[PDB]
Ligand binder design. Structure first.
Ligand SMILES: CN[C@@H]1[C@@H](O)[C@@H](O[C@@H]2[C@@H](O)[C@H](O[C@H]3O[C@H]([C@@H](C)O)[C@@H](O)[C@H](O)[C@H]3N)[C@@H](N)C[C@H]2N)OC[C@]1(C)O
Ligand SMILES: CN[C@@H]1[C@@H](O)[C@@H](O[C@@H]2[C@@H](O)[C@H](O[C@H]3O[C@H]([C@@H](C)O)[C@@H](O)[C@H](O)[C@H]3N)[C@@H](N)C[C@H]2N)OC[C@]1(C)O
Lengths: 260, 178, 203
RNA sequence: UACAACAUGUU
RNA sequence: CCCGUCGCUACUACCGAUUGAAUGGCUUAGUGAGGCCUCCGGAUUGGUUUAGGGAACCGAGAAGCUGGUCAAACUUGGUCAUUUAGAGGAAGUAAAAGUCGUAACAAGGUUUCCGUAGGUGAACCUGCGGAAGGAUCAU
RNA sequence: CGGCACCUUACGAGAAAUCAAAGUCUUUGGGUUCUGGGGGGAGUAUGGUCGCAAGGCUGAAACUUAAAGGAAUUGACGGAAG
RNA sequence: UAUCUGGUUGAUCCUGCCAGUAGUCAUAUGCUUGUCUCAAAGAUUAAGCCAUGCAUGUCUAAGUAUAAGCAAUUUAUACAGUGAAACUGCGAAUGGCUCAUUAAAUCAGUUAUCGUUUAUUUGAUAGUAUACUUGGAUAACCGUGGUAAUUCUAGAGCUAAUACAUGCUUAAAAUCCCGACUGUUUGGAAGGGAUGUAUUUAUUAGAUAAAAAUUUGAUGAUUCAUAAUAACUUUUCGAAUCGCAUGGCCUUGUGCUGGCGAUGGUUCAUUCAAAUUUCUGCCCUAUCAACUUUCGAUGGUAGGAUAGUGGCCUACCAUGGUUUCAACGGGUAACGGGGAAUAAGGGUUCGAUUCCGGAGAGGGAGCCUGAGAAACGGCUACCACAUCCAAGGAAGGCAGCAGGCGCGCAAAUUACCCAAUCCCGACACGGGGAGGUAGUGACAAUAAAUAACGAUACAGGUUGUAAUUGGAAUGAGUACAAUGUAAAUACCUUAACGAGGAACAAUUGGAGGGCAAGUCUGGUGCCAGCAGCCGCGGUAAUUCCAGCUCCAAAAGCGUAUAUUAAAGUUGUUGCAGUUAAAAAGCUCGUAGUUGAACCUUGGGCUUGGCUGGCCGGUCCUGGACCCAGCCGAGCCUUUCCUUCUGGCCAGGACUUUUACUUUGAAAAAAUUAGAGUGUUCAAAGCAGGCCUUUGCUCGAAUAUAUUAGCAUGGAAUAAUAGAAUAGGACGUUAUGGUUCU
RNA sequence: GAUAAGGGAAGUCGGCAAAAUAGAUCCGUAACUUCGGGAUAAGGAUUGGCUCUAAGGAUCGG
C-alpha cells in the first residue's frame, strides 16, 4: 500500500525470537541486509533478550554507539541489524565472541566461541556465474559475493570465508556422506549425514539425512547446509546439544536426572 | 494494540436448576466444608470433570501408546503431589473414582481445621481470611489454596499474628489501657 | 489517465465487472510519440523507478545495418513506403518499428567502393559512367591492390539489392522503437524478406 | 304429514 | 355440538384515477471544467560569442495558442432496485352474554364429500359425471 | 409360466385401524423421481404464462393463533336396526 | 452427561407444534453494588455533520554561518566554540482510523516471473586512449511597500554550497581499420584513426552418435550469464566535496609523499519491497435461460504504450468466448481469512472489531513530486456541504486523539508523558494523541468479606439442639512513611486511628404444576391484577395487593431480542408421505443420478521382524530349536516387472488415461489441546531456580493443519483405450529400394 | 405578405390565426392489442465541396 512497511507488530514477529506477548505493541523490525527478515536475529534482540546485558532498547543504542558490537569483524551501529546464520558476533570490551547457530529446538542459541574460531564463517553457495569483464563469482547465503572462486565450486557447496579478507579459504563438495545441518522446516537445527539426494526436475529436491542416533529424516534441498566433511568433524563449533533430537520422555528423564 | 490476554471461566451451573436430591447434596458439602456459596462446589465439579475427561481420553489408548505414557503419567504426578491420590493408585483407573470431597479435603481450610489450628471449619476459614495462617513463611489468605503433600507439615501460624508470636490487635491494645 | 488495467474489460464469460478500486499510477499509459521525419526533436520522459525514456518526435537520420556485409552506417531516412499495421502511417510518414523505409545509400556506397574496389548500380548514365570508370581505376598502392584482389570473389552482391543502388535509396526496415529509445535504427532488406516487401510494394 | 333452536364462565 | 350472511369496534395486507412521489445504481445523446501530451508563441533573460559604437549570431524561457487524451459535472431520454401517498373498492383476522335462519355431526331428519355449470339474504340448493372417507364387504 | 383377486396366521410392521406388504427399517445404506415440516391467512395477492371465455399452471408475505388433527376406549345420544 | 419435562382427552396411544431448561469474546435494559487482579468500549442507525486544541518532523567533530545572536580571549586577523534564520539532504507512501464499495472480485492455501521496477541495507565493482582546484546566480539579511484578510508576497541592494552549470590532472603494451611509400610472387613500413562503462541496432561465440575410403559457465528448459565485430547517442559517469589527526623522505623545495573516517557514484548480486500471475475453494435467488460481440467480445499478425507480459490500446483479419456440472442477471440488513459459541459423531450459527490481506479518506475525476502515491493532516477542477470579508476577495475536509451536534435500544476525558514498545531524521541529543499512564467503565473473566469462640440457664440421648454473659480476631475506611511512577494515582508493605443493632444492617427473583419453596393472616370479589405455557381471580384466592414465614442464586439477580443444544421438528449419518402435512391423472422423454457376470488363480522351497508359551535363560530385559499367530522379502511353477549400454548404481530410447487409498516435504503468530513453573490461590504470564557471589543453571516443549497443489507405495473396487474390410505384434543377427541425420 | 428584445396562451368561448416539425441514412422506440397493429410512436446522430479507394458485371479465348 503506497510503499514499504517500517513497523512490525509484536504478534507478527518471528516465533524463534521468544518475544513476550505483553511488553508492547511492536517488535524490532530487522533492517535490510545480509539475511531475510524472517530468518534473521536483530542485534537489539540478541543483546537485550538473550544476553540480558541491556535492560531496554535505549541502552542497546548506548552500547552500540561506542563501537562495542561487531558482526563478522565489522562494527555495526544499527540497533536492528539483520544478523543471521553463521554470523560471528564479537564484544571486544567484554572480550567475548558468539556465533548465531540454530539449536535442535529451532532457535538462535547463545553460543560462546573462542577467538581463533571467531575469525571465519561458513557460507552456502547459492549460485555462480560470470560478471562484468568475464569474471566469475559465487554468492553465499548472506549476500556475500566473492570474485575468482575455485573452478570446482558449485551450488549448495559450502565455502570457508576468512572474515578479515573476505576470501575463500577452502570449500566442501555436496555429496553423499557429508555432515550437514538443516536450516529450515520442522527439522530446524538438527545435524546429520547425507544418505541419498533425490532429484525432481522442475520441482523440489529432497535430501535423506541420518543423525548420529540412526533416525532417517528427509528435508528439502533448500534447507540443507553443508557443515562438515564427514560424521563428527564439523568446521565450526556446535551448540550445547550436538544437534540431536530427543523425545519428550527423554528430555523429561534428563531434566529429572540433573535436577533430581 | 497490545495482544489480548487470555481469560476463562472456572465453573458451570447445573443444567437442571431445581433437582432436590443434588440440592441437598450440595448443601451437605457446603456445610461439611464450610463453603460460602454453591459456586465453590461448581468449581471443584468443573475441575473434577475435566480431570476425569482427560483420564478417559488417555485410557482410550493402549498401555503402550506414547501419548498415554507421557500425559497420563504427568496427570498422575500432579494428582499425587496435591494429595488427591496416595502412593498406591497410579494407574488412571483410580483417577476416575475421585469425588469432590477428595479436592475439598486438600484445601487450606480443611487442613487447617484438621491439623488443630482451629476448632470449627468456619473458624478455620475465618483465620485464613484474616492473614493468621502461613504456609512455609508465606502468609496465605486464600481458603481455596490447595496444599501439596510436600507442604502439609509446614502449615502453622504467622510470626506477626497474636496466635503465633506477634503483638496484640487493636482490641487488646485498647482494652489493656485500664 | 490512460490505464493498462484488465479490470475494466468484460470477463471471458462476457460478464460485466464491478469497479474494485480507483486507477493506480503503477498501471498507467502515455500518449504515442508518432515520430515523423524532420529536424531532430527528442523529449525526455521520467518513468517508473526514476528511469528515463526518450520520445522521438522528429528524426532525420538513423543507424542502419548491412547484415550480409557486417557494417553499419549513420544515413538519412528518405521516407516511409510500407507499414504492416496501418497504411495511414505510410501516408503521413510516421516512423515506428517494422516500418519499411528508404534511406540514402551514399555511406554504404563509399564503404563498398573503398572495400572491394568496384561499383554498384549498373547504370551506364552519361555522367554516371564517368564516375564508374574513374572508380574502376584510381590512384592506389600495390599492397592495397593485392588486399582488394583477395577481397574479390566475396564482392558481388545479390541482384535485387544491387539494382537499387542506381537510385541512391535502399529499402530498409526500422528495428528500434523510436517512441521509447528516441532513435530510428534498422537494417538493409535483403533476401526473401526483400522479395516479399517488393512484391507487396508493387501491389 | 309436520319436529326450528336452548346466553357467559367455572369449581 | 355447530355453519354462513348481518350489526359495533380494532388491527394487517391487497386493488386503485392521480401519464402519483422519492431514494440508490447503470446508461444513450448534447454540453463540457481541469490536468496531461502536443503545436506554435515569445513578457523576459544570459551570452553558442562577436561586434569601432555593438553588428551579424546562439542558449534558457512566463502568459497565451493549435490538435489530441483522460474526463469531473450538468441537461434530456432510457433502464434496474428499494421505499412510499391516495378518494374509493374488495378481503383477512381478533374481540363473555346483539340479529336471521339451521348447513354439518345420528340415515342430522333431502346420506356425506370431489370436479364443473347455473341460481339464491345467508348458511346453501339444483343439473351432469365421480368417491365411500356409507347408512350395503352378503342373496 | 403370466394376470385380476381372495382366505388363514402374525411371522415381522404399525399410534392403532389394519398390512404378504404398509415385511426384510436405531441390527438404521439395492437404484431412482416427486412431495411434506403446527393450525390459519391461502392456493389468496403479485409478476409471468397458456386459454375465445370459464379458467389452468407457477405462486408469496404481512398478520393471526394453542392447538388443529389421527386411531382407538368408556359413556351418552340418534326423526338407526334387533 | 449420546438425558428431557408441561400443554389438545372423561380417560388413552399418537402426530405435531407451543412452553419450560442450559450456553453465548452477545447486544440492550431494570434493580442492586463492599475488596484485589484483569479488561471491552460511537461497529450495528448516519462512509452523517463538525467549533476548538493536538496528531510530522529532522544536524553530527564530518554539506552551506560576517545573525548587526551568546561566549572565548584562545592554538589562531581567512573561519574555527555555542548557536536562531535560511539554502541543501532525508522523511512526510510508515503508522493510526474505518468497513462504504466489492460475490471469481477480495481472500486462503498453493504456484510463476525463462514477464518486470526496486530508495535504502549488505557484498562486490571503474588507470581508458585553470587543475596548488571554473563560473554566476539565489535564499537567509538590510531597506521600500501593497491588501480588510491567508503559512500572500512584490520592487531594490548584498552574499555561500554535497544547490545549479561546466571541466583536465594516468600507467605499461597489445589488437582491429584505412593506408602515402616500398620490398616485389605476397612483405616492412611513415601518417592517420578505434579501444572503459552507459544507450540503440545488426551480425558472430556461447560445442559435444561410438570402427576404413582442438579447448570452454548456469538451468528441467532459453535468443541466459558472458564475450566479439560494425556503428549509434540533443553522450550517462570513471569525486572541482567534508572532519579529525597530522607522520615519513631527504636531491630542504611552502617539494614529494600518506593514517582513520564523512558524503558520494556505474553495474551486478543481496535485502526491504512492489506489480502482474497458476490451480482449487464463496451466501440467497429461475417471480433471472440464455449471455458476450453497435462503442474488444474470443483468437491471429504488426505496431503503440508500460517497469514489464497481456485486447492494455490501435490497424487489418477470422468468428469466436461462457452456459442446466446453473452462465448471465438480481439481492445481500456481504470486506475476506486466522478464528468463536455450541458441541457423542455428523452438524448449526457467529467472525465490524487486538494479527494477516484488501479498499477508502464528503462524492467523482485528473495530477505534481518522489525509489515508492493516482497521497487527500499534497495540489487541480466540478458537485454537495461549510468559514471569514472593508463586497474587491480569501480559506476548507476528525472513517487520526479528545471533544460537540445528530442519530438512535445502543458506546468514556476537549487529562499526563515520551519513562517503556517501537518508528522517523543530517541524528547517542530532536520528534511521535504510534504508543504508554491515569479518568469514565457491573462488556466479559479471576480470587474473595458482610462474622468467629467461650461460660451460665438450658436441654437432648455421650453432644446433635436454647436465650444472656465475656474476651479476643480483623479488614472496609482513613492516614504519618517508604515503595511504586516520567511525575502521579492505585496495588503491596506500614506508624497512629478504624465494630454490638459488630445501623460498617445483601440483593434479585419466586413459594399451584413443569420447578425448590405455605392451603398461614388481612385486603379485593371475573374488578384490580397475575400468568413464558397449563391456568388464577365471580365474598374461606396456597396464583392478585400486602404482612409473616419459606425457597433459589448471590455481589449479583431479573427482563427483551438474536443464536446454539434440546431438534431424528431439515434427517448424508438420520425423518415422514393408506387414514395425522405430504405419491404428479397417466404414459413418453433429454440433462442428472445409477447401472448383470467374466481375464493370475492354486502350489512349493528359502527367509526377515513382532506377540504369548516347551525349552527359562525371571531380573520388565533375552537365548539354537519347538507349539502356535500376525506382518514382510526372494525364486520356482507357461509368469506379468518397459527395451538396449555400462558391469546392484548410472545412461539413451520408450511410456493408455483416471478416480481411490498409503506415506513424505512444506505449511506466521495469536487462539485450541497440552508438558513445566507456589503469579500468596486463581484467571493469567512465560517465567524461573540454585551455596549467596563479581556467579552458575533447566527452559520458553509437544500435537492439531491438509480440501486444492507438489512428491510418493498399492493395483482390490469403478471407469477408460487396444487386433475384425487387420492399416495388428515381434524379426533382435532375414533380404532389398530410397532418403535423411 | 414579412420581421421583431424579454416573457411564452397571461390573450380568447376556444391556441382561432400563426409558429414550430418536415427529405434521406443510421440508431432507438412504451401502454395497449382483435397478434394483423399501435409505429415515422416517443426520441437521438448524420448530411457540403474536393481528391481518392474498395465492392457489385458482359462477351471472347483450352
Ligand atoms: C359461526 N358463524 C358466525 C356467525 O354465527 C356470527 O356469529 C356471531 C359472533 O360473531 C358474535 O360475536 C362477535 O361479536 C361480539 C360482539 C362485538 O358483538 C364479540 O364480543 C365477539 O368476540 C365476536 N366473536 C356473537 N355475539 C353472535 C354470533 N351470532 O358471526 C359470523 C360467523 C363467523 O359466520
Ligand atoms: C392447570 N390446572 C388445571 C387446569 O388444567 C384446569 O383446566 C380446565 C380446562 O381443562 C377446562 O377445559 C377446557 O380445556 C380445553 C383446553 C384448553 O384444555 C379448552 O380448549 C376447552 O375450552 C375446555 N374443554 C377449561 N374450562 C379451563 C380449566 N377449568 O383444570 C383444573 C386445574 C387444576 O386448574
Amino acid at each position: 500500500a503506497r510503499g514499504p512497511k517500517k513497523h512490525l507488530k509484536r504478534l507478527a514477529a518471528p516465533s524463534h525470537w521468544m518475544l513476550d506477548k505483553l511488553s508492547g505493541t511492536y517488535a524490532p523490525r530487522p533492517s535490510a541486509g545480509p539475511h531475510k527478515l524472517r530468518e534473521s536475529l536483530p542485534l537489539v534482540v540478541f543483546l537485550r533478550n538473550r544476553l540480558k546485558y541491556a535492560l531496554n532498547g535505549r541502552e542497546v543504542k548506548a552500547i552500540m554507539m561506542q563501537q562495542h558490537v561487531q558482526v563478522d569483524g565489522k562494527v555495526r551501529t544499527d540497533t536492528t541489524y539483520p544478523a543471521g546464520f553463521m554470523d560471528v558476533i564479537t564484544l571486544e570490551a567484554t572480550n567475548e565472541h558468539f556465533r548465531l547457530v540454530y539449536d535442535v529446538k529451532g532457535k538462535f542459541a547463545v553460543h560462546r566461541i573462542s577467538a581463533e574460531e571467531a575469525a571465519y564463517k561458513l557460507g552456502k553457495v547459492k549460485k555462480v556465474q560470470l560478471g562484468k569483464k568475464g569474471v566469475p563469482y559465487v554468492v553465499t547465503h548472506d549476500g556475500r559475493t566473492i570474485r575468482y572462486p575455485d573452478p570446482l565450486i558449485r551450488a549448495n557447496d559450502t565455502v570457508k570465508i576468512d572474515l578479515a579478507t573476505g576470501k575463500i579459504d577452502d570449500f566442501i563438495k555436496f555429496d553423499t556422506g557429508r555432515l550437514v545441518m538443516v536450516t529450515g522446516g520442522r527439522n530446524l537445527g538438527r545435524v546429520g549425514v547425507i544418505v541419498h539426494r533425490e532429484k525432481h526436475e522442475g520441482g523440489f529436491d529432497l535430501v535423506h539425512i541420518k543423525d548420529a542416533l540412526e533416525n532417517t529424516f528427509v528435508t528439502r534441498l533448500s534447507n540443507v547446509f553443508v557443515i562438515g566433511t564427514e560424521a563428527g568433524k564439523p568446521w565450526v563449533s556446535l551448540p550445547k546439544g550436538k544437534g540431536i533430537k530427543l523425545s519428550i520422555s527423554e528430555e523429561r528423564d534428563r531434566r529429572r536426572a540433573q535436577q533430581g | 494494540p497490545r495482544a489480548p490476554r487470555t481469560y476463562s471461566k472456572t465453573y458451570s451451573v447445573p443444567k437442571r436448576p431445581y433437582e432436590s436430591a443434588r440440592l441437598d447434596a450440595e448443601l451437605k458439602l457446603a456445610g461439611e466444608y464450610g463453603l460460602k456459596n454453591k459456586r465453590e462446589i461448581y468449581r471443584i465439579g468443573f475441575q473434577l470433570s475435566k480431570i476425569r475427561r482427560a483420564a478417559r481420553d488417555l485410557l482410550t489408548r493402549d498401555e503402550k501408546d506414547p501419548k498415554r505414557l507421557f500425559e497420563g503419567n504427568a496427570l498422575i504426578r500432579r494428582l499425587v503431589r496435591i494429595g488427591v491420590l496416595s502412593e498406591d493408585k497410579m494407574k488412571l483407573d483410580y483417577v476416575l473414582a475421585l469425588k469432590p470431597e477428595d479436592f475439598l479435603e486438600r484445601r487450606l481450610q480443611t487442613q487447617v481445621f484438621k491439623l488443630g489450628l482451629a476448632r470449627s471449619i468456619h473458624h478455620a476459614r475465618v483465620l485464613i481470611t484474616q492473614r493468621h495462617i502461613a504456609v512455609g513463611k508465606q502468609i496465605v489468605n486464600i481458603p481455596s489454596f490447595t496444599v501439596r503433600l510436600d507442604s502439609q507439615k509446614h502449615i502453622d501460624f504467622a510470626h506477626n499474628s497474636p496466635y503465633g508470636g506477634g503483638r496484640a490487635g487493636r482490641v487488646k491494645r485498647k482494652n489493656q489501657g485500664k | 489517465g490512460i490505464s493498462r488495467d484488465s479490470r475494466h474489460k468484460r470477463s471471458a464469460t462476457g460478464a460485466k465487472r464491478a469497479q474494485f478500486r480507483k486507477k493506480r499510477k503503477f498501471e498507467l499509459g502515455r500518449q504515442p510519440a508518432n515520430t515523423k521525419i524532420g529536424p531532430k526533436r527528442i523529449h525526455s520522459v521520467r518513468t517508473r523507478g526514476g528511469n528515463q525514456k526518450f520520445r522521438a518526435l522528429r528524426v532525420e537520420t538513423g543507424n542502419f545495418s548491412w547484415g550480409s556485409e557486417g557494417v553499419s552506417r549513420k544515413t538519412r531516412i528518405a521516407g516511409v513506403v510500407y507499414h504492416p499495421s496501418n497504411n495511414e502511417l505510410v501516408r503521413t510518414n510516421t516512423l515506428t518499428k517494422s516500418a519499411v523505409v528508404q534511406i540514402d545509400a551514399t555511406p554504404f556506397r563509399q564503404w563498398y567502393e573503398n572495400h572491394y574496389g568496384a561499383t554498384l548500380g549498373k547504370k551506364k548514365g552519361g555522367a554516371h559512367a564517368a564516375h564508374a570508370a574513374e572508380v574502376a581505376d584510381a590512384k592506389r598502392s600495390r599492397k592495397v591492390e593485392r588486399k582488394l584482389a583477395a577481397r574479390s570473389g566475396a564482392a558481388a552482391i545479390e541482384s535485387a539489392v544491387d539494382s537499387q543502388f542506381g537510385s541512391g535509396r535502399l529499402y530498409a526496415v526500422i528495428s528500434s522503437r523510436p517512441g521509447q529509445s528516441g532513435r530510428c535504427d534498422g537494417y538493409i532488406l535483403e533476401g526473401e524478406e526483400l522479395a516479399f516487401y517488393l512484391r507487396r510494394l508493387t501491389a
